[PDB]
């Protein structure tokens, strides 16, 4: 009975939710052949010596009804809250995603990691001082990633699993 961790990836349209997940699951950067519909994926990985299974919901179609999203938001054990470092509006949306997760989990204590994706781009508009101050106000880790180069991707998911391990 290998430990299973249920993870959910949330964030504004276009921040790279699918790109982060597809690098971990399929070892490539998202292209026109990868599907765009919301789905869950499974992956066996070794994190700090523990062989475990990750079950990841990649959210999409945010305005439409989804029975899977309804189930997995309630059972999710940890959430990656993603913004893009070149899109201030996506960073401004983070607090709304976090407030919704707390509302649906009916708890003030939910494992989460703040992810600033697209860190390969020169056009940064969200400074790390602003993002780190937000993560510190929530008591959660902050990591910057590039799903394109894969920088930080595996570490973002492993960091979230480390936060889930502290919940219990």
């Amino acid at each position: 009975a290998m430990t299973e961790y249920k993870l959910v990836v949330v964030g504004a349209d276009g921040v790279g939710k699918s790109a982060l997940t597809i690098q971990l699951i399929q070892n490539h950067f998202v292209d026109e052949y990868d599907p765009t519909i919301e789905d869950s994926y499974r992956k066996q990985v070794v994190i700090d010596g523990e062989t475990c299974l990750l079950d990841i919901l990649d959210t999409a179609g945010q305005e439409e009804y989804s029975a899977m999203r309804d189930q997995y938001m309630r059972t999710g054990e940890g959430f990656l809250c993603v913004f893009a470092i070149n899109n201030t509006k996506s960073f401004e949306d983070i607090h709304h995603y976090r407030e919704q997760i707390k509302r649906v989990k009916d708890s003030e204590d939910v494992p989460m990691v703040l992810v600033g994706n697209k860190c390969d781009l020169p056009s940064r508009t969200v400074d790390t001082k602003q993002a780190q101050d937000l993560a510190r106000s929530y008591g959660i880790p902050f990591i910057e990633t590039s799903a394109k180069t894969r920088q930080g991707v595996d570490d973002a998911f492993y960091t979230l699993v480390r936060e889930i391990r502290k919940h219990k």
């Binding site: 945010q62 305005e63 439409e64 009804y65 999203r69 949306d93 995603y97 919704q100 509302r103 649906v104």
Partner: peptide
């Protein structure tokens, strides 16, 4: 906005 549509979230209702 939600931001996600979740059927049992009171804000979505």
């Amino acid at each position: 906005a939600x931001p996600l549509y979740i059927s049992y979230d009171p804000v979505c209702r």
